[model samples]
Target: KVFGRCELAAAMKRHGLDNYRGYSLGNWVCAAKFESNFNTQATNRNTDGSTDYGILQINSRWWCNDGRTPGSRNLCNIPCSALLSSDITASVNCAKKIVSDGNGMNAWVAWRNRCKGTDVQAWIRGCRL
Candidate 1:
């Protein structure tokens, strides 16, 4: 599903992303907006044969197994296909693991580029959580 702004905000909040690791809901929403435009089935392939999947663009190089990323670690112990599901719970859970793995919100380049230390008030506007 392609989530609308407030809709994405509500979903991520329900999955416990708000203020996670000192990162606001805006940051999460903004990251998703840029990474996948709130599209659950989004995927991007890198030049290195590594692929990024789902809302936050979780990478197959380390987070999930795609059988195509050379020497893939599958650190998240999930199939890459799992990240593309309509149910975003798995995506959210994997994102949490990515954050907990010590990278924080900066694990996603898009988040760092657009969300880090930025005023994201408009990102989650009108979203009642």
Candidate 2:
């Protein structure tokens, strides 16, 4: 499921994620854009050979089960497919848990590399949230 920027912003705000863990909705929106372009079924293979799952690109190495790709920490104790749903509720819950683990949004390399220190007004501009 692919969500537009405004739609994504509205959903995040509706979920009280506008200021989750002191991070602005823009940050989350920006990160999601960079991570998976708001596509629920997005997946990618990292340089380390681990797979990234869903919108926030949660990693198989530490957050989800990818069967047996080598080293799977499964810290979130969920199937990788769990993050692939268009509903987004489960993925949001998992992301909150990841942030609570002390990594913050830094858990996502895309956030640090792109969303961080970048202007994100465009992420929430047209959203009436």
Candidate 3:
């Protein structure tokens, strides 16, 4: 499903992503905008035989197991398919794990290229918390 900007922010907030790792909900909302455009089933295949899945676009190699990627570490101990579902709990948890891995938000290139040093708080301004 494709979520409205604020709608997705609320969802992520409910999942406890708000300032999960010193990054505000706005930072995550901004990354989600570019990463998957709030699409739940979004998937992107990488050139390195890996794939990014779900709204936050987590990687298959080091995070979720897609059962196709070679040498998947299954760091999140979840199937990549779980990330594509409407229930975002698992996917959000995976995102948290990724952030907790010393990677910060740069775990996503989209975040680095777009929201890294920007005023992403504006992304959640009209959402009214």
Candidate 4:
């Protein structure tokens, strides 16, 4: 599990998120738990062959390639799983952007708070505001 935290922190940092091993993990893990139950290796199929990857359950074909090599389809090319694997810190930053972009995580938070109860999204919205 130590390696998990290490990888998590590394991923967070690569994405410009601050305080890699601080309270951020709790939030990220919270989202991961609610999203895919913390299964970093978990894979969920979409309409086509695209699948979700990592703890955050991001779509690989849309950011990374979902393949074993480069120069393929990057599931999160600019603002998705790229940040997830590019840098842990940056991932959070990207997450923040998505959540606060009014059409991204912020909208998701509003939906979650209204329907799923106040949890990670609520806390993030409050802190962000």
Leading candidate by lDDT: 3
lDDT of 2 by residue, 1-129 (tens): 998888889988887778889888999899999999999899989788789999899888888898865777888888989999988887888898888757788888999999888886668876778
Model 4 residue 99 lDDT score: 51
Question: Judged by TM-score relative to the true structure, which candidate is superior, 2 or 4?
Answer: 2
- Provide C-alpha RMSD values for all models, in order: 1.1, 1.5, 1.0, 7.7
Instruction: Look at candidate 4 and tell me the lDDT of residue 81.
Output: 40
Task: Provide the clashing-pair count of each candidate structure.
Answer: 0, 0, 0, 27
1-129 per-residue lDDT for model 4 (tens digits): 112443544454455443333334335545555555544444566766666555555554535564543344652445334433423443344355445434443233323443343453332342321
* CA lDDT of each prediction against the hidden true structure: 0.89, 0.86, 0.90, 0.45
Estimated TM-score for each candidate: 0.94, 0.91, 0.95, 0.45
Check candidate 3 and list the clashing pairs: none
lDDT of 3 at 24: 92
Model 1 misplaced stretches (Cα beyond 4 Å): none
What residue runs in model 2 are displaced by over 4 Å at the alpha carbon? none
Better of 3 and 4 by TM-score: 3
Badly placed stretches (over 4 Å) of model 3 are: none
Those runs of model 4 whose alpha carbons end farther than 4 Å from true positions after fitting are 1-27, 68-102, 106-117, 121-129
Better of 2 and 3 by TM-score: 3
Better of 1 and 3 by lDDT: 3
State which candidate has the highest TM-score. 3
